[PDB]
């Protein structure tokens, strides 16, 4: 049953009308398929944008419910070498369908992990067998693909999910589940997503589990922040104010009590302070240079461990010394 799959897998789009966020590419692909001219596609974009769902729904709309048989889907989980290409992909492209009549579809998902020799062998397979089969390459990084292979396909960039589409999907999930969500809670949820539907679905399931109730109540900002462990804008701005204006010992005490009262992480506070200070209209860019350099150094040091108190004091001192040049 579908009630056992996680929310990321349960709510996977099955038709092209359930893929939100991407409109300019979805309409163009629908027109390509209706008019017949479907070229070799290259879906490039960040994780969680809906490239795999888009191509799966496309193959479903093209071949019907028997998609799992008329399409050759290869990914990084499967062995994709040069010999694998030579045998499997060439035998698939050269032959025809065993279930119906029509062009074939080869979905090379996550093809950014393929060997250079494999791409060099495939770039002539795409150019030779082009009247009976098509190629779809999904990628997160366009630098791992050879320029020859990159030039044979039409590139579609999957933009991050905007506010309207992610709110539409959230409303769809809140309709499918016996769940209510606060408006400010929804805004905070959209803020900690960066256009990643996977994160939204995961944390929505997690905060529904956090409710502890038969779901007769609502999900507020407190639930989201306590479940995702993300700092609140209130505590963020309080720490920033105490760092910018208050005394050194008082700033240290404030940072300690804020990061220990809710168990917040220093890296999340660093990213939040970076995001907040990005809107600050500042004087001569030397302060911004020092701030960015020191904050990136502290983040790279945190990414390897160390003393949290020493790193917090380093953040405080870096912000203070950077702002001391603004006078």
């Amino acid at each position: 049953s579908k009630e056992n799959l996680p929310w990321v897998e349960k709510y996977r789009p099955e038709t092209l009308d359930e893929v939100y966020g991407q409109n300019e590419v979805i309409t163009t692909v629908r027109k390509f398929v209706d008019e017949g001219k479907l070229p070799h596609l290259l879906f490039y974009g960040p994780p969680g944008t809906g490239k795999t769902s888009t191509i799966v729904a496309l193959a479903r709309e093209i071949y019907g419910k028997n998609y799992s048989n008329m399409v050759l889907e290869l990914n990084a989980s499967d062995d994709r070498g040069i010999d694998v290409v030579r045998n499997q992909i060439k035998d698939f492209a050269s032959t025809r369908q065993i279930f119906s009549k029509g062009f074939k579809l080869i979905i090379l998902d996550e093809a950014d992990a393929m060997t250079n020799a494999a791409q060099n062998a495939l770039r002539r397979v795409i150019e030779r067998y082009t009247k009976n089969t098509r190629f779809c390459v999904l990628a997160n990084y366009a630098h791992k693909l050879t320029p020859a292979l990159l030039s044979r396909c039409t590139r579609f960039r999957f933009q991050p999910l905007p506010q309207e589409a992610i709110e539409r999907r959230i409303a769809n999930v809140l309709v499918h589940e016996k769940l209510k969500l606060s408006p400010n809670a929804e805004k905070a949820l959209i803020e900690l997503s960066n256009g990643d539907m996977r994160r939204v679905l995961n944390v929505l399931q997690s905060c529904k589990a956090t409710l502890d109730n038969p779901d007769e109540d609502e999900i507020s900002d407190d639930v989201i922040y306590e479940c995702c462990g993300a700092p609140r804008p209130s505590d963020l701005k309080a720490v920033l104010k105490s760092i910018l204006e208050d005394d050194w010992g008082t700033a240290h005490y404030t940072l300690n009590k804020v990061r220990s009262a809710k168990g917040l992480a220093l890296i999340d506070l660093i990213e939040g302070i970076v995001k907040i200070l990005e809107d600050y209209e500042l004087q001569n860019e030397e302060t911004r240079v020092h701030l960015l350099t020191k904050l990136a150094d502290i983040e790279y040091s945190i990414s390897k461990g160390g003393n949290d108190q020493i790193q917090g004091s380093a953040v405080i001192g870096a912000i203070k010394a950077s702002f001391e040049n603004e006078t």
């Binding site: 990213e271 240079v289 960015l292 904050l295 983040e299 990414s303």
Partner: peptide
């Protein structure tokens, strides 16, 4: 280098641009 180690964020690129401008 920093990015290949998994520390790839916007802050690292901002610091790179700041160092280039410096």
């Amino acid at each position: 280098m920093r990015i290949l180690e998994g520390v790839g964020t916007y802050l690292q690129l901002a610091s790179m641009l700041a160092k280039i401008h410096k």
